Structures are given as C-alpha cells and as structure tokens.
Write a protein that binds this ligand. Sequence first.
Ligand SMILES: *[C@@H]1O[C@H](CO)[C@@H](O[C@@H]2O[C@H](CO)[C@@H](O[C@@H]3O[C@H](CO)[C@@H](O)[C@H](O[C@H]4O[C@H](CO)[C@@H](O)[C@H](O)[C@@H]4O)[C@@H]3O)[C@H](O)[C@H]2NC(C)=O)[C@H](O)[C@H]1NC(C)=O
Lengths: 49, 97, 49, 49
Amino acid sequence: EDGDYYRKQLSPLEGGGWLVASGSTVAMTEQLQMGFGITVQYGTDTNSV
Amino acid sequence: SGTPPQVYNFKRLVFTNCNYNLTKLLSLFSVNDFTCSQISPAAIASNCYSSLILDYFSYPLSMKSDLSVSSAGPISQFNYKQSFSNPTCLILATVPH
Amino acid sequence: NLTTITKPLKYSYINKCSRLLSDDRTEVPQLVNANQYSPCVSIVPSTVW
Amino acid sequence: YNITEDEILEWFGITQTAQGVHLFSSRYVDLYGGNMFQFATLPVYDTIK
Ligand SMILES: *[C@@H]1O[C@H](CO)[C@@H](O[C@@H]2O[C@H](CO)[C@@H](O[C@@H]3O[C@H](CO)[C@@H](O)[C@H](O[C@H]4O[C@H](CO)[C@@H](O)[C@H](O)[C@@H]4O)[C@@H]3O)[C@H](O)[C@H]2NC(C)=O)[C@H](O)[C@H]1NC(C)=O
C-alpha cells in the first residue's frame, strides 16, 4: 500500500542504528506502463553491441 | 517476459558481444516517453557500443518527470539514478492492445 | 624591477575537447598542430573562470 | 597598395602558409610575360578555410 514503513537493523561496522524507509505506490493505470533505463558505454567492453 | 519490477528493483541486463535490434523490439512498443539524457534519442540503436546495460522496470507516465537526474524527487533520491559520465536514456512505454 | 609587463588573473587551459556530430553517439577527434589552435578555443573566452 | 592601368593580360596569386598569407603579382616586373612573384606576406594568425 501507499507509504509502507520498512525497517531493518544495521551492524555498527556498516554504520549501525536502524535503517528506515517508506515505500509509496502509484496505482496501476488502465494499461501497464514500463520504464527502461539505457546506458551505453564505449570503453568498458568489446565494441560489439 | 514476466512482471516488470519497480524502479528501485530495476532488472539489469548487460549486453556485450551480442547483436541487438530495436527495430525488432520497438515494433511491439507503444512508447509514450522517449527521452535520452546527455545523448541523442534517435541514434540509440544505430551506432556500435562496447557495452549496453539496460534496467527495465514498471514505471507510469504520471511520474515521468522524476526520471531525470536533475529531478529532486524520490526516484533520483532513493530509487534509481542514471549515469552522468555515460550516455543515458529514459523510455516509458505502454502495453499494446 | 620592471612594470611594463603584467600578469593574468589566473592560469587556465582545456582538459577536454572533441567534436560531436548530428547523430550524437560517436566522437570526432581533435588534435592541435605545431603552435596551432583547436576550434574549442573559438567558444572558450580569453580566460576560463 | 598602388598599381598602374593597362589592357594587357595578367595573373594574381593567393596562398596561405604558416608564416602568413602570400600575395603574388607579375605586375611588378613581368608585365609582358606573366608568372607569379611574391610582393606581399600578410601576418596572419591562423590558417583560413
Ligand atoms: C592588348 O593591348 C596591349 C596594349 O595595352 C598590346 O600590348 C603590346 O603587346 C606587344 C606584344 O607583346 C608588345 O610588343 C613587345 O615589345 C617589347 C619591346 O618593347 C618586346 O620585348 C616584346 O617581346 C616580348 O614577348 C615575346 C613573346 O611575344 C617574348 O619572347 C620576349 O622575351 C618579350 O618578353 C614584344 O615584342 C607591345 O609593346 C605592347 N604594347 C603596349 C603599348 O603595351 C597587346 O598586344 C594587345 N593584345 C593582347 C592579346 O594582349
């Protein structure tokens, strides 16, 4: 549901305390809309994409 | 194939040394938003690249403006940020009938 | 013991210069010649801020 | 620059070189023939295109 509170315990080596978050929801529209993030690189790998 | 995840649990596919063709992929796409940050949108499938990392997720067109790096909303804060030093692209599509 | 020559505000140069075409995926290289000037200087002012 | 007037055929030469812009005229000596000798070398900064 909208604005669900999610919490977890973090070890003091990683920083400690409690990690908290809120997950909001934008409801489904009449049709599914999906998102693509595209990132191309020119020097990381072999130039064969 | 399968349920597209959300914008913070984006599904990563890395492609390298394989053949890709958007004309066989965009031919089944009812794309609404077609933008590309720091790079051209039109020539994305044209030139040859070393690597292509594509994260696909479920994203409505109602929340479209948070996609940008310059946005200060939840998406650029905690969900997904695109590469500044690498060419990037934001495509919001809708399922065809 | 000399005042006819003066000093600039601060030193400056270029750390990145190349050309981009209309397709905007491929980079065209630029190179300086013997005491010459790349066209990147044409848009850079007298002193980089 | 000065020149005289005539009804005799003539030539003029333009080129660019790293020292400057060379201007060639046969009106100085070879009025009756015609072949290109330098009279001017303009102090240009870069190479025109
Ligand atoms: C256009 O009108 C002009 C007049 O404005 C007219 O010019 C005349 O041309 C003749 C032919 O060249 C000239 O006669 C010359 O006389 C000198 C001595 O004063 C000679 O040294 C010349 O010989 C030269 O040419 C030889 C080849 O033809 C070379 O081998 C030689 O080494 C010399 O360089 C030549 O006999 C005449 O003096 C001028 N007159 C004037 C008033 O300038 C010209 O003929 C008309 N027509 C054309 C097509 O230009």
